[PDB]
Enzyme design. Structure first.
Site, PDB file in Angstrom:
ATOM      1  N   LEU A  37       0.813  -1.199   0.000  1.00  0.00           N
ATOM      2  CA  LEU A  37       0.000   0.000   0.000  1.00  0.00           C
ATOM      3  C   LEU A  37       0.847   1.248   0.000  1.00  0.00           C
ATOM      4  O   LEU A  37       0.593   2.148  -0.790  1.00  0.00           O
ATOM      5  CB  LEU A  37      -0.989  -0.017   1.164  1.00  0.00           C
ATOM      6  CG  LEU A  37      -2.136  -0.980   0.824  1.00  0.00           C
ATOM      7  CD1 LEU A  37      -3.074  -1.166   1.992  1.00  0.00           C
ATOM      8  CD2 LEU A  37      -2.907  -0.503  -0.425  1.00  0.00           C
ATOM      9  N   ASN A  50       8.616   2.786 -21.223  1.00  0.00           N
ATOM     10  CA  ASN A  50       7.963   4.063 -20.970  1.00  0.00           C
ATOM     11  C   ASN A  50       6.741   4.115 -21.831  1.00  0.00           C
ATOM     12  O   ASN A  50       6.352   3.085 -22.411  1.00  0.00           O
ATOM     13  CB  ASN A  50       8.867   5.217 -21.387  1.00  0.00           C
ATOM     14  CG  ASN A  50       9.093   5.262 -22.905  1.00  0.00           C
ATOM     15  OD1 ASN A  50       9.374   4.237 -23.546  1.00  0.00           O
ATOM     16  ND2 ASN A  50       8.982   6.447 -23.477  1.00  0.00           N
ATOM     17  N   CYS A  75       6.086   5.239 -24.874  1.00  0.00           N
ATOM     18  CA  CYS A  75       6.230   4.870 -26.297  1.00  0.00           C
ATOM     19  C   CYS A  75       7.115   3.660 -26.617  1.00  0.00           C
ATOM     20  O   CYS A  75       7.449   3.403 -27.790  1.00  0.00           O
ATOM     21  CB  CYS A  75       6.750   6.047 -27.094  1.00  0.00           C
ATOM     22  SG  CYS A  75       5.567   7.349 -27.220  1.00  0.00           S
ATOM     23  N   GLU A 119      10.215   3.176 -26.375  1.00  0.00           N
ATOM     24  CA  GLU A 119      11.592   3.334 -26.827  1.00  0.00           C
ATOM     25  C   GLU A 119      12.578   3.407 -25.661  1.00  0.00           C
ATOM     26  O   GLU A 119      13.795   3.211 -25.835  1.00  0.00           O
ATOM     27  CB  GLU A 119      11.767   4.502 -27.811  1.00  0.00           C
ATOM     28  CG  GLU A 119      12.075   5.859 -27.207  1.00  0.00           C
ATOM     29  CD  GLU A 119      10.815   6.592 -26.722  1.00  0.00           C
ATOM     30  OE1 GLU A 119       9.731   5.947 -26.669  1.00  0.00           O
ATOM     31  OE2 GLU A 119      10.905   7.810 -26.387  1.00  0.00           O
ATOM     32  N   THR A 138       5.758  16.695 -33.949  1.00  0.00           N
ATOM     33  CA  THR A 138       6.092  18.114 -33.847  1.00  0.00           C
ATOM     34  C   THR A 138       7.465  18.443 -34.451  1.00  0.00           C
ATOM     35  O   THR A 138       7.572  19.270 -35.345  1.00  0.00           O
ATOM     36  CB  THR A 138       6.048  18.566 -32.389  1.00  0.00           C
ATOM     37  OG1 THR A 138       4.910  17.970 -31.768  1.00  0.00           O
ATOM     38  CG2 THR A 138       5.957  20.089 -32.285  1.00  0.00           C
ATOM     39  N   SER A 139       8.501  17.783 -33.953  1.00  0.00           N
ATOM     40  CA  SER A 139       9.895  18.047 -34.322  1.00  0.00           C
ATOM     41  C   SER A 139      10.129  17.885 -35.826  1.00  0.00           C
ATOM     42  O   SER A 139      10.789  18.723 -36.462  1.00  0.00           O
ATOM     43  CB  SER A 139      10.795  17.064 -33.563  1.00  0.00           C
ATOM     44  OG  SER A 139      10.015  16.259 -32.671  1.00  0.00           O
TER      45      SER A 139
END
Lengths: 16, 728, 578, 146, 16
Positions: free
Chosen positions: B231, B428, B430, B432, B615-616
């Site tokens: 817990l 994680n 994604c 990778e 984005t990049s």
């Protein structure tokens, strides 16, 4: 979608 | 006549030539663009007393709407126009101010960090100012500018005013990251870095690009927590997740250790998984808008059948955790039970002394312990045919796209870490990232270890030769290393991770364009050797820089937990079956490197990780990570109208490109992923792809799904990220 | 639809040339011996070579024993039971004869005023009057009902044809025109409120609405301030979105810009204001409410229609003869046809109003190598509608000499020396520079002295039947494609746009236009010279917008582009699927 | 619904026996003094002791400024548009004063008869007339069509 | 269909 049928004797021939 | 409202308030006749003049400057060098077409489409929308700002958005969008594969240069005509509008919006004119003047203005306005003025003198600013080429704003594509405008340039939340241009971003990101260097080298580094980024060779993640120069210090965007079976630890895991998501971070939770339903977590995993999900979404618009996580578990967990279906859009609510992704952890034993069509025995981790640990660290010790515990009557367990569980997983992976695989033996037999000291036991968001973790038992527990990584990528499309990667590795690794000392640490366990191992994950963008420009293809094996030669260059030069930095500044405190510390390089540990798919000789001296690392150390326990990108890769007009494009033109939905981005160099290379859905199947791609994994420190965000209209009766056979699952294990692939299924 | 035939046996009794010649004989039969058969010949020629187009009931009935030809009636209802009964009875009479109707029920008082039970139950009663003579209750009989945007019940009226909702709040088999002026639009730009009032509670607000925009300003703000008056406030962004959201959803919630209709009009609004339109929004004429069906002090407005084929004329000055022919024929028709309601005769005898339009605008534009969407056609359009208005007036002036101006000529602006070229929305100055080509001062004086036979001459109407007979593009609209498909017992009917082989790259098709802007500039340029209004459409392709969805922002921005360029009415919205 | 009252202030002005005597008064007003009040006395007795029962618009309106007491009207429609229209308007007038309507629409000619369109489109029209003074969908004014 | 969002400050710049 997906075809449930799985052939094990096909598979057993794969080496990892 | 037709009058025009200015920024002040008075009219004045419309200046049709001034427009045609700006318009003319903008088509500088571009081919196949009609200026008259742009006037004829915008001018029809002009109304008596229209304001200046409007004239300007009207001509941009009209340039913008003309982007097509046949006339791709509009991509740039629209940019330059927007770039122009943005200069006037920021500085009220075209020429940007002197950089020193600008910085003082921004500091007093409270939008830049004052540290910038204490760290550099006006003369040093005057010198940086000479590195700047403001003409580089002229090289962005339009989809790029839209991203700068929205996500990158320092601006106003409320009023919507824009305060800087792109070259002021690049130079100040550079100043900040390299600010602690000594006088002899500093402004050389700032220049050499500024150059790398403003010419699109090195790509930085969003929070860096958005925040480095400003008063903030939040830049960790990638956290990995492991939860213990108590817990206290769930409370600690949850609290930590809370802290980090308030700062826009993706999370990898390992809740595999949690004990199963009805063991001596008495009420089981699912209620605790839900509690993680609400932690995750604790800072989100309606309960879906920001905050993201992937949760991990071993395939043999007693409740696996109930966990495999958590995000299923059927079912009842107390059995459904749909706003998280999962990674199922698999090793050689499971796959063997699959080939041999036998059973898999499930156990609760609480009932099987050292099975969980042997899972990740010692495959033999797992063999011995698994068969041992299978034989023992006194142990609560559960058998199921292995064809059943695998189909269930795969049937779910196919249905949602987002049930992911971690091959945990590969992660520990081919890794920068020694699994007897510091095993990799999760990934994680994604898939990778692959780093060691320790469970906490309070949020501020000092003996905990949450893992962070700081990311970046080279633009394979921008480098003119592999040895250009030397300088870039040096630049990349030094910047991200400075960043580590620079950023904030909300949780002590997370600082311990980052200070102790200083882990990095530098990837690539523009793989697809790169492959085209060398006239190769994903699907047929034509690119195996080029890929082998390329990732050699990459790993090698990334190590070389981290070795050089370890000399100048010290290896990382926990360097002795790595294989590298013992003389073991990735080229010693890669899945041997790759030998049969490429014969590219090593080009660089790996023994010189072996000795130099073993002696001087590494600054960073990891350097490489192939991540997804969007984005990049927009800002540089590059294909996304290592993936083939779905088509030649990208469509984004935007308040400002439709955003189009045509793949780099289409006109010359449309027949070079192999598009996603033009690939006969997954085989070459996986051969290519596996070839990368020979040199990558961590993992690869590897996709699988299925076009239903390539299969009898439009339906994808479970047989191909598994046959591919095994192709990836065999070639040593550590993780599988999304499944994409095309519609029709 | 045209040749005289058998209802039952299906036998056909005449050919087309016998139609044209007898339509001509009949319309020109009362001319004196010296000119008659010259007129019959010159008219016969105009129609059989497709230069002048006639509406269906004329083409179908002129030669036969019938006398029903009015197909376009405008009624205004007063705020009393008698008038509703009169309005309804009149609607009944006229629809039995296949006529489209424009009802103005704006004067009806709002729900719970000292029409105690409100407008909607009365609107329904109009709808049943309308559909009183229709197959199953949808097959013939058509109407558009009008109301001001400030009517207390507007929110409840805006949604009448909505395919959701409950039945006692639904009038779905009629179209509506919402009436807007400068004040409303100003409350929209400034993001303030609009105050609703019931017409019964606001002395002379309704009249000032149409006749005097200043007097409206003064009276509106005055009544807003007064506590004793039942009223209702709502943000103006809200009401406009609601209207536009409905216009988009059904295609058929229409706009009348009532100030434009009175500041730029053949009528003086202090005597005879334009306070509504008709079924298709092209007609704009003065009306008086009746108080019995046979009330003589009433005035229902009629118009008799036609059109020139811009595709058939070899030069603009060919329009002189055609105007003479067109205006004389339709004028004879007025004395020829029947008048079921006295108020409707008073309208037609007192003002003798005509509405002559065009077909084949799109082909015309192609044949001169121009386009709707880019401004390349502004000047050609300006030059063209000059020719049109000018020669239509010239003929009506010449006919007023020979036979007398119309009894109520003194209610027009024309009677005072005011021409349309004096009153057009000034902002058009910024979108075309085409000089006037014809002597408008010679015309000014000649009208002022001799008068006009017809208080109106021009009106741009939609067309389908007529433009099929000549193989011409429909009214002023760009074609959806190059080939038209009609469903027919005899198999599929195909009609390929005129001169396709040579002009397929000249044509700008409907859905090839970047947007509504050039088209509205072109409509507004017509409105500079047209006596009444234009059946003007708006068009939206969803796959030109982020996420396949049309932003309320573009809808309103276009609503204002039209007001600015002086556009009086907006008819259908077309939304393409995919 | 009987007692004279303000329908917004909710004030009641009279009581049941005033209702009864004054209703007697109004309906016998024009009688000759020789017998007037005697009639008024006896009709009041009869209604106030429930022997004679009166209809609502008489019970609520007689004594007040109003004169609309017809609750009950029968209209016959001829087979012609003018007749239809006349019928329609007659209805509208009456239902705005609250009456119920019986309507004989039997002689309207059938659909297809050499008015090609038949009874139903006109029956809708009577319905909208009957409801022309009622809230919306199902509330006030009624008719039976024969 | 239709995008409810309306910008008044955009609009306020229109002249009628």
């Amino acid at each position: 979608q997906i075809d449930s049928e799985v052939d094990t004797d096909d598979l057993s021939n794969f080496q990892l | 006549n037709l009058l025009v409202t200015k920024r002040d308030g008075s009219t004045e006749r419309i200046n049709l030539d001034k427009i045609h003049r700006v318009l003319d400057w903008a088509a500088e060098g571009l081919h196949n663009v009609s200026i008259s077409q742009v006037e004829l489409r915008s001018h029809i929308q002009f109304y008596d007393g229209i304001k200046t700002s409007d004239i300007h958005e009207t001509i941009i969008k009209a340039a913008a709407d003309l982007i097509s594969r046949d006339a791709p240069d509009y991509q740039y005509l629209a940019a330059r126009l927007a770039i122009f509008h943005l200069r006037k919006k920021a500085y009220g004119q075209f020429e940007p101010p002197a950089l020193y003047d600008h910085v003082v203005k921004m500091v007093e306005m409270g939008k830049y960090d004052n540290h910038l003025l204490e760290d550099y003198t006006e003369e040093e600013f005057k010198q940086m100012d000479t590195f700047i080429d403001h003409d580089r704003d002229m090289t962005f594509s339009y989809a790029a500018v839209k991203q700068l405008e929205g996500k990158y340039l320092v601006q106003n939340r409320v009023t919507g005013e824009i305060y800087e241009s792109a070259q002021f971003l690049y130079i100040l990101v550079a100043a900040c990251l390299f600010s602690n260097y000594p006088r002899e080298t500093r402004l050389q580094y700032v220049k050499r870095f500024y150059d790398a980024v403003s010419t699109f060779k090195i790509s930085l993640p969003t929070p860096i690009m958005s925040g480095v120069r400003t008063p903030t210090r939040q830049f960790s965007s990638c956290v990995l927590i492991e939860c213990g079976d108590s817990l206290d630890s769930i409370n600690a895991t949850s609290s930590a997740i809370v802290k980090y998501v308030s700062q826009r971070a993706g999370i990898g939770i390992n809740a595999g250790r949690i004990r199963a339903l009805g063991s001596p977590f008495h009420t089981g995993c699912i209620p605790f998984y839900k509690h993680f999900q609400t932690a995750v979404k604790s800072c989100s618009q309606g309960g879906v808008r920001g905050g993201a996580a992937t949760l991990f578990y071993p395939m043999w967990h007693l409740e696996v059948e109930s966990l495999l279906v958590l995000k299923n859009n059927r079912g009842v609510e107390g059995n459904r955790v749909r706003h998280m992704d999962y990674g199922v952890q698999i090793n050689k034993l499971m796959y063997t039970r699959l080939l041999k069509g036998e059973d898999i025995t499930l156990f609760s981790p609480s009932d099987v002394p050292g099975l969980y640990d042997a899972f990740f660290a010692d495959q033999e010790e797992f063999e011995r312990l698994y068969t041992k515990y299978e034989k023992d009557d006194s142990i609560r367990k559960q058998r199921v045919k292995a064809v059943e569980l695998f189909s269930l997983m795969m049937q779910e992976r196919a249905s949602t796209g987002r049930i992911y695989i971690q091959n945990v033996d590969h992660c520990n037999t081919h890794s920068p870490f020694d699994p007897a000291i510091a095993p990799v036991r999760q990934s994680n968001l994604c898939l990778e990232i692959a780093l060691p973790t320790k469970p906490l038992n309070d949020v501020n527990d000092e003996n905990g270890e949450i893992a962070l990584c700081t990311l970046s990528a080279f633009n394979l499309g921008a480098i003119n030769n592999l040895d250009e990667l030397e300088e870039l590795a040096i630049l990349a690794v030094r910047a991200l290393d400075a960043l580590l000392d620079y950023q904030d640490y909300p949780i002590p366990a997370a600082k311990r991770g980052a200070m102790g191992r200083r882990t990095l994950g530098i990837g690539v963008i523009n793989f697809a364009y790169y492959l085209a420009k060398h006239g190769k293809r994903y699907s047929d094996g034509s690119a195996n050797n080029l890929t082998h030669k390329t990732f050699e260059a990459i790993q090698y030069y990334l190590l070389k820089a981290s070795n050089e930095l370890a000399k100048e500044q010290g290896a990382c405190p926990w360097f002795n937990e790595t294989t590298y510390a013992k003389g073991i390089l990735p080229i010693d540990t890669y899945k041997k079956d790759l030998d049969t798919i490429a014969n590219e000789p090593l080009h660089y001296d790996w023994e010189a490197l072996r000795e130099s690392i073993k002696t001087h150390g590494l600054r960073n326990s990891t350097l490489s990780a192939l991540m997804p990108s969007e984005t990049s890769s927009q800002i540089s007009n590059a294909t996304n990570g290592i993936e083939p494009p779905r088509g030649y033109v990208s469509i984004k939905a935007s308040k400002d109208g439709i955003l189009r981005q045509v793949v780099p160099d289409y006109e010359h290379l449309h027949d070079a490109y192999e598009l996603l859905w033009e690939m006969p199947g997954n085989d070459g791609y996986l051969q290519l992923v596996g070839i990368m994994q020979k040199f990558i420190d961590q993992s690869i965000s590897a996709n699988t792809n299925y076009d239903p209209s390539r299969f009898p009766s439009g339906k994808v056979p479970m047989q191909q799904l598994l046959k591919d699952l095994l192709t990836a294990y065999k070639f040593g692939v550590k993780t599988l990220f999304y499944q994409n299924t095309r519609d029709g």
